[PDB]
Design an enzyme around this catalytic site. Structure first.
Site, PDB file in Angstrom:
ATOM      1  CG  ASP A 125     -62.948 -53.103 -35.667  1.00 18.00           C
ATOM      2  OD1 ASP A 125     -62.429 -53.423 -34.581  1.00 18.00           O
ATOM      3  OD2 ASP A 125     -63.997 -52.427 -35.742  1.00 18.00           O
ATOM      4  CE1 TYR A 176     -66.424 -48.789 -22.360  1.00 13.22           C
ATOM      5  CE2 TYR A 176     -65.288 -50.431 -23.728  1.00 13.22           C
ATOM      6  CZ  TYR A 176     -66.197 -49.388 -23.599  1.00 13.22           C
ATOM      7  OH  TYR A 176     -66.884 -48.950 -24.715  1.00 13.22           O
ATOM      8  CG  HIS A 187     -64.919 -53.367 -32.235  1.00 12.68           C
ATOM      9  ND1 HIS A 187     -63.676 -52.766 -32.194  1.00 12.68           N
ATOM     10  CD2 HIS A 187     -65.506 -53.105 -31.046  1.00 12.68           C
ATOM     11  CE1 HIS A 187     -63.526 -52.156 -31.032  1.00 12.68           C
ATOM     12  NE2 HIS A 187     -64.622 -52.344 -30.319  1.00 12.68           N
ATOM     13  CB  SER A 242     -63.564 -50.902 -27.518  1.00 10.80           C
ATOM     14  OG  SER A 242     -64.020 -52.235 -27.761  1.00 10.80           O
ATOM     15  CE1 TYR A 243     -63.174 -43.431 -24.304  1.00 10.82           C
ATOM     16  CE2 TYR A 243     -61.910 -44.310 -22.469  1.00 10.82           C
ATOM     17  CZ  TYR A 243     -62.406 -43.225 -23.179  1.00 10.82           C
ATOM     18  OH  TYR A 243     -62.121 -41.950 -22.748  1.00 10.82           O
TER      19      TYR A 243
HETATM   20  N1  LIG Z   1     -69.606 -47.419 -30.142  1.00 12.48           N
HETATM   21  C1  LIG Z   1     -69.913 -47.347 -28.715  1.00 12.48           C
HETATM   22  C2  LIG Z   1     -69.771 -48.721 -28.104  1.00 12.48           C
HETATM   23  C3  LIG Z   1     -70.925 -49.391 -27.713  1.00 12.48           C
HETATM   24  C4  LIG Z   1     -70.860 -50.656 -27.142  1.00 12.48           C
HETATM   25  C5  LIG Z   1     -69.621 -51.261 -26.964  1.00 12.48           C
HETATM   26  C6  LIG Z   1     -68.449 -50.607 -27.350  1.00 12.48           C
HETATM   27  C7  LIG Z   1     -68.515 -49.329 -27.931  1.00 12.48           C
HETATM   28  C8  LIG Z   1     -67.245 -48.647 -28.312  1.00 12.48           C
HETATM   29  C9  LIG Z   1     -66.444 -49.134 -29.347  1.00 12.48           C
HETATM   30  C10 LIG Z   1     -65.261 -48.454 -29.646  1.00 12.48           C
HETATM   31  C11 LIG Z   1     -64.863 -47.322 -28.943  1.00 12.48           C
HETATM   32  C12 LIG Z   1     -65.645 -46.854 -27.907  1.00 12.48           C
HETATM   33  C13 LIG Z   1     -66.818 -47.514 -27.595  1.00 12.48           C
END
Ligand SMILES: NCc1ccccc1-c1ccccc1
Ligand SMILES: *[C@@H]1O[C@H](CO)[C@@H](O[C@@H]2O[C@H](CO)[C@@H](O)[C@H](O)[C@H]2NC(C)=O)[C@H](O)[C@H]1NC(C)=O
Ligand SMILES: *[C@@H]1O[C@H](CO)[C@@H](O[C@@H]2O[C@H](CO)[C@@H](O)[C@H](O)[C@H]2NC(C)=O)[C@H](O)[C@H]1NC(C)=O
Ligand SMILES: *[C@@H]1O[C@H](CO)[C@@H](O[C@@H]2O[C@H](CO)[C@@H](O)[C@H](O)[C@H]2NC(C)=O)[C@H](O)[C@H]1NC(C)=O
Ligand SMILES: *[C@@H]1O[C@H](CO)[C@@H](O)[C@H](O)[C@H]1NC(C)=O
Ligand SMILES: *[C@@H]1O[C@H](CO)[C@@H](O)[C@H](O)[C@H]1NC(C)=O
Ligand SMILES: *[C@@H]1O[C@H](CO)[C@@H](O)[C@H](O)[C@H]1NC(C)=O
Ligand SMILES: *[C@@H]1O[C@H](CO)[C@@H](O)[C@H](O)[C@H]1NC(C)=O
Ligand SMILES: *[C@@H]1O[C@H](CO)[C@@H](O)[C@H](O)[C@H]1NC(C)=O
Ligand SMILES: *[C@@H]1O[C@H](CO)[C@@H](O)[C@H](O)[C@H]1NC(C)=O
Ligand SMILES: *[C@@H]1O[C@H](CO)[C@@H](O)[C@H](O)[C@H]1NC(C)=O
Ligand SMILES: *[C@@H]1O[C@H](CO)[C@@H](O)[C@H](O)[C@H]1NC(C)=O
Ligand SMILES: NCc1ccccc1-c1ccccc1
Lengths: 724, 729
Positions: free
Chosen positions: A666, A505, A698, A588-589
């Site tokens: 998404d 992550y 997402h 995601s990240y």
């Molecule tokens: N938007 C903050 C967040 C919070 C919880 C889980 C994932 C993410 C997130 C989604 C996409 C990119 C970076 C973080």
């Protein structure tokens, strides 16, 4: 036998929870039927039967009992919107008579409902406006008349405040005794819309365009206003009068956010505001005034929380915990050495005194009493990925007791807590290295009353399956500890070479190395495919102080990316890792870092999978992106925004096998982000594999899509690892 | 060695190692054509070509010249630049005009930027152009233009240009402007899309676009509200810069105005006579009007006695639309390809004032097109030679004696040439033949007086040189008997093909109504690579629904899309495997568009014949495709018409069966034709039944996935998928 993909996807092995909701200072509700339990004895009477609402016709999603226990709110017609937001129908059930109310009912498509904290007053949001019911069967008073779909939000959050600021749809705050109703108003008028297709069911001839006000990095943000209405002096003749509380002068000078709302007393509320450049926040303390009816926040009562090395707070400035008289509060702030600790503030004084110290962090303040502050921290054995409940004596800060550390050190090293209404009891939630354990405790003497759930059912089921183990440990880099975990296959042999999947992550304040027991995809990979699946918390990761966390300030896609590569290199040097078969994946990240890593040309990784990745930071929302990246302007951080794209690394993907997956609906990380990655790869002639998921967001969380993606990912990893 | 070691590789195909030389010309008069070495005016008879325009003349221009267009009188040239593609035919461009006699650019009253269509009058140098959905006319290139229309409205009202569905499905062109033969009249169509629903999709653009764009296109899906159409004729000779131009409406015949209808053909017959064909929304009934200009009225009148009805009781009318008429010089007679009493398409000779026509050609074969007619001869392309529907030759029939038919192209070089097209000079005195036939393409010039060959224009000898050394595949073109009917196939066979070996087979499928995948055309494509390099047989089959073999075969799938044409492809593979040289553990199928649909239907059939397959931009359910094409074959998706089969021939309903096959699903995200929607619905259905499959979207690519980089990527991708399906290293 082993723990299979099917086991994971079909939940053959289920972790039992013990979810309870405290009703009072000694009673709590639990679903078996809904029973009331006594904390003193553990005895239970039925509160509402399995089919008390048999001839209802509707299907009940959730319930909400009023604080005075006189009414129950039944929630049905659940339609999920974003992460926390949804719509629902509501019915009020008189508990004193056991019968549904039929007069002046709460409308369909209600956005948010909540009881006042005492009694049975009700506040709901419908069509973006706020309504109040003093009595469940009486007409509701309309508080706001400015509600407008996609534009004005009264008492509910817009997309970005929901996701990035409040982790909630609601922007309604009752005062402790239910007299005042505080709310936020969000204006999205000039905020641009993200647009994408929603294909819907096969029978929909023309795709629907979804349009959501969503500020990407450097775009026009929503504006916010804050009001407090007196719900005791409501007239059914004249429109309710809302008293505005303006953001302080230090915030009005530019774009800003409301980032915290916390009542101190019956007539005192604290608000936290954050500049758009999120290294400066201010707390106002506002008191209700008598012969004026207004709210005054003395300039002298302002508390400033800023950061020289990064943003403020872990994700936002921390919330304050006021002493009963509301003249003092405790909150987590980073100390002079960058570690997050509890500071004790006087309403009137600028300096606070730190009551905790050390090279570890307080995670959260959990409860405050007359004699004790309770908190959770990762102090036990210097392990950032452990969680324990501590008690701190207010009259002597040195007298600190770990309430959970020693209860079961073998199986439990990660706790959360839920105190009763006045903290007279607490349920401990151990998610620890071993199976989760849920226990009830009397806080007067800290003894354990009883085991609520021990997961012996799971425990014996698991006796018959070759289960993987977890190694949690650290490596040294530049005279600094960096933590990592490995999900090791059963009968692990140090002398044999395993393929390794690096689960990433690596977002700012992330923690992927912890003592939590999980049953997930990794569990199957290790158990059945004999893959080691590792995670690593490098620079930018949380709960280890700001020197580590702030390392990536304004530099996303650098240190956190390099450190993942370095971790994989270090893992090769442990001798049991096949370096011809190292892989990386993330969501995601994690999708972003995986992609950044695969495009680094480091040669360390054979293959990877990015799920719903960010590909460049201008595509992502403002509140999150700007927090770490600043603004994408020539006078701020444009150069690094331009430098930190996955697209710019396309050429390097020639060296690796890639899988790119993204849901087309998404709303969070827009398909756009992957659409641009794929385009760039094509433009440089890189072969790769893709998968889109129609109408998935997402989470890609549809039962069928969830199963499909993991199945698909399993084939890809097994193919990459030459596993038949 | 010295024997062929080379093969035709994937790189050869993607990088164009082996280029087919063309010879594109454009007749200027009856004895001269233009060509490009530089622009020359070749004399057809001598070979002497004086230089007409040097390459350097527009170096100072400051823009890259996409195309050019010389006025019929060779006095002016139109230079096209800032070309911006829209749909399959439509685009936008800037235009400048160079005065060929005065030797310089016209700077006054220039054609505006963003012009949608420009065209010279067929004689002289009058100009007509469409801009912001309106028609303008310049009588001279440097004078102010006359504004014909004032109603043009982006996406709503189109003047002289087609909307999406008319461009793609009706006229195969962006223009809806038709000049009278000597330029006096300018006929045009006007489309109205006010209530046509919009297809909407994301356009991601360059990575610098922060927010994706949503493209919105008026696009009628099967059964939706269609565009309406009105037709006009303006006299360009009586334009004035003092009063607005007067456009004379020609209304559709009452038999058409009764319900939804289309204009399907516009054909000038003479200076003062135009013929219109109109089609009912149920495309089994069409009416040709023939309309004379009235001198005293200044109006146009279509006499009901001169009205001509073409219909079909077995399917739709025409191959894709009613055929165009070819008028005799006096405009009192015309020739037109129609289906005879036993479903074969032949040239019928019509009299303007008469109902019944007389067929000038007979036989169990078909006329492909009428190419030219003079006082004494009609020239046409057909597939009569050797009874091969996939073959094409130029024929000459004597107007005074129908038993006197001469084949002009049949015997020129029978072995390398069995597929011809023709380009006649302005009055048919000379013609160029394009052989694409079994051998390397051949371009030759002829004089029609004696039909002797004047010269070889291009013989692809450079390519023959390069190929002399590479192990190229061969083509087997033959047929199979099914229900006592011949159905033709082709096989691209690997070099040194061995009947005794067991080759993997790829079924290259299209199978749409009136399709033809088995022909005599020489191709250098992906199939060439698969055979030459990978030793895969790639076969194609024309089953029920295919064209050029009569209405009996072509109408078999009428109102029944996704049935026999699908079943016949499966049946074909069975035949191929039973020929003895196919490894039936390795049979794949692949297709694009309709072929993608057929691929998907075959893979979802549960026949067990195919291991894997690729569908590119497939149609998934007919309610998603456009009204004009779909309704032609499927009727309306209404309970009292054909909803039953609409619902019964979706690929989604077959999702469960994909468990048995390896599937790769490909689609461009900006596909305006077969919307990404169609694949998005397929994928969702496969996810819903837990079938694993492979996918690839192409960001911002359309139905062609034609970008240089995307084109190479999809073929590389498919090559990997097919190689792995067939266990090829
Ligand atoms: N938007 C903050 C967040 C919070 C919880 C889980 C994932 C993410 C997130 C989604 C996409 C990119 C970076 C973080
Ligand atoms: C929400 O914010 C918008 C944008 O700032 C406000 O709209 C403006 O309102 C003023 C005064 O009413 C007008 O003169 C402007 O022309 C408006 N601009 C736009 C872009 O609409 C709007 O008033 C705000 N709404 C609320 C309820 O606060
Ligand atoms: C309370 O405020 C609302 C909105 O400002 C009032 O509703 C509007 O009243 C005005 C006239 O006063 C009308 O022109 C609008 O059309 C009304 N909008 C709607 C549909 O609510 C409401 O009347 C106010 N109540 C009073 C009288 O104090
Ligand atoms: C294009 O067609 C539309 C109808 O689809 C025409 O709009 C109509 O205009 C008349 C008179 O102006 C109105 O009575 C109707 O209500 C309109 N139709 C509907 C239902 O929208 C329009 O006039 C046509 N455009 C042109 C200029 O030809
Ligand atoms: C628990 O037991 C006591 C009697 O010992 C009883 O009075 C009380 O109401 C019980 N509570 C519940 C939850 O039923
Ligand atoms: C909610 O919606 C249903 C369906 O239209 C309707 O029958 C019902 O009366 C509504 N209930 C309320 C509280 O308005
Ligand atoms: C709630 O607080 C308000 C404001 O301080 C006060 O007037 C009232 O007494 C309280 N309500 C009760 C009765 O607890
Ligand atoms: C906040 O950020 C800006 C931009 O990075 C910086 O110049 C400024 O010094 C920071 N402010 C504080 C209070 O640290
Ligand atoms: C082409 O050749 C003819 C005949 O030899 C010659 O007279 C003429 O100059 C050439 N054509 C032109 C008009 O340039
Ligand atoms: C077309 O656009 C360019 C650039 O805006 C301009 O210089 C030129 O004059 C335009 N051409 C015409 C003929 O309008
Ligand atoms: C032509 O028509 C338009 C509107 O239809 C009008 O505005 C224009 O002035 C007319 N031209 C003249 C001046 O006759
Ligand atoms: C073109 O056609 C019109 C209409 O028949 C006629 O009046 C005119 O004379 C023709 N022009 C020439 C020069 O042949
Ligand atoms: N729209 C008719 C057409 C013409 C040429 C090529 C392909 C197609 C086509 C596309 C999609 C579906 C069916 C046919």
């Amino acid at each position: 036998k082993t723990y299979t993909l099917t086991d994971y996807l079909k939940n053959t092995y289920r972790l039992k929870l013990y979810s309870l909701r405290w009703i009072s200072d000694h009673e709590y509700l639990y679903k078996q039927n809904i029973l009331v339990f006594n904390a003193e004895y553990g005895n239970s009477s039925v509160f509402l039967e399995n089919s008390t609402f048999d001839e209802f016709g509707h299907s009940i999603n959730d319930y909400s009992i009023s604080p005075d226990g006189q009414f129950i709110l039944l929630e049905y017609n659940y339609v999920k919107q974003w992460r926390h937001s949804y719509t629902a129908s509501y019915d009020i059930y008189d508990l004193n008579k056991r019968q549904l109310i039929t007069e002046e009912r709460i409308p369909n498509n209600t956005q948010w409902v909540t009881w006042s904290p005492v009694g049975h007053k009700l506040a709901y949001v419908w069509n973006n406006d706020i309504y109040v019911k003093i009595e469940p069967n009486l007409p509701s008073y309309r508080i706001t008349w400015t509600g407008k779909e996609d534009i004005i939000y009264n008492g509910i959050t817009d997309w970005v405040y929901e996701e990035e600021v409040f982790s909630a749809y609601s922007a309604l705050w009752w005062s402790p005794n239910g007299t005042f109703l505080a709310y936020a108003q969000f204006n999205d008028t000039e905020v641009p819309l993200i647009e994408y297709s929603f294909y819907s069911d096969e029978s929909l001839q023309y795709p629907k365009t979804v349009r959501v006000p969503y500020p990407k990095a450097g775009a026009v943000n929503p504006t916010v206003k804050f009001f407090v209405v007196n719900t005791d002096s409501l007239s059914s003749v004249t429109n309710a009068t809302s008293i505005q509380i303006t953001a302080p002068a230090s915030m009005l000078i530019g774009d800003h956010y409301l980032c915290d709302v916390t009542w101190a007393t019956q007539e005192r509320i604290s608000l936290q505001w954050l500049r758009r450049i999120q290294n400066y926040s201010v707390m106002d303390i506002c008191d209700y005034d008598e012969s004026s009816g207004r709210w005054n926040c003395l300039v002298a009562r302002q508390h400033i929380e800023m950061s020289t090395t990064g943003w403020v707070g872990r994700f936002r400035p921390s919330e304050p915990h006021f002493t009963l008289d509301g003249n003092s509060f405790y909150k987590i702030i980073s100390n002079e050495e960058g570690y997050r600790h509890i500071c004790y503030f006087q309403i009137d004084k600028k300096d606070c005194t730190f009551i905790t110290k050390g090279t570890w962090e307080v995670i959260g303040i959990e409860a405050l009493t007359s004699d004790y502050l309770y908190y959770i921290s990762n102090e036990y054995k210097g392990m950032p990925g452990g969680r324990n409940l501590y008690k701190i004596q207010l009259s002597d800060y040195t007298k600190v007791t770990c309430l959970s550390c020693e209860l079961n050190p073998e199986r439990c090293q990660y706790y959360s807590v839920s105190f009763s209404k006045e903290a007279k009891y607490y349920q401990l939630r151990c998610s620890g290295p071993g199976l989760p354990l849920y226990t009830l405790h009397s806080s007067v003497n800290d003894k354990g009353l009883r085991v609520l759930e021990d997961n012996s059912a799971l425990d014996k089921m698991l006796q018959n399956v070759q289960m993987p183990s977890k190694k949690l440990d650290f490596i040294i880099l530049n005279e600094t500890k960096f933590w990592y975990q490995m999900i090791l296959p059963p009968h692990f042999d140090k002398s044999k070479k395993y393929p390794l999947l690096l689960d990433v992550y690596a977002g700012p304040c992330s923690q992927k190395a912890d003592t939590v027991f999980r049953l997930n995809w990794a569990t199957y990979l290790a158990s059945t495919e004999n893959i080691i699946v590792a995670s690593f918390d490098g620079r930018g990761s949380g709960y280890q102080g700001d020197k580590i966390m702030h390392a990536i300030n304004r530099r996303l896609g650098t240190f956190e990316v390099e450190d993942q590569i370095e971790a994989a290199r270090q893992f090769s040097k442990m001798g049991f890792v096949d370096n011809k078969r190292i892989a990386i994946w993330g969501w995601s990240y994690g999708g972003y870092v995986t992609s950044m890593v695969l495009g680094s040309g480091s040669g360390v990784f054979k293959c990877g999978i990015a799920v719903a990745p960010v590909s460049r930071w201008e595509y992502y929302d403002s509140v999150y992106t700007e927090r770490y990246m600043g603004l994408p302007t020539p006078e701020d951080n444009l150069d690094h925004y331009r430098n930190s794209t996955v697209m710019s690394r396309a050429e390097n993907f020639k060296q690796v096998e890639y899988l790119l997956i993204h849901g087309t609906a998404d709303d969070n990380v827009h398909f756009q982000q992957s659409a641009q990655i794929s385009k760039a790869l094509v433009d440089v002639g890189v072969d790769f594999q893709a998968m889109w998921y129609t109408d998935e967001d997402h989470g890609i969380a549809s039962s069928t899509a969830h199963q499909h993606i993991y199945t698909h990912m399993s084939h890809f990893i097994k193919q990459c690892f030459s596993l038949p």
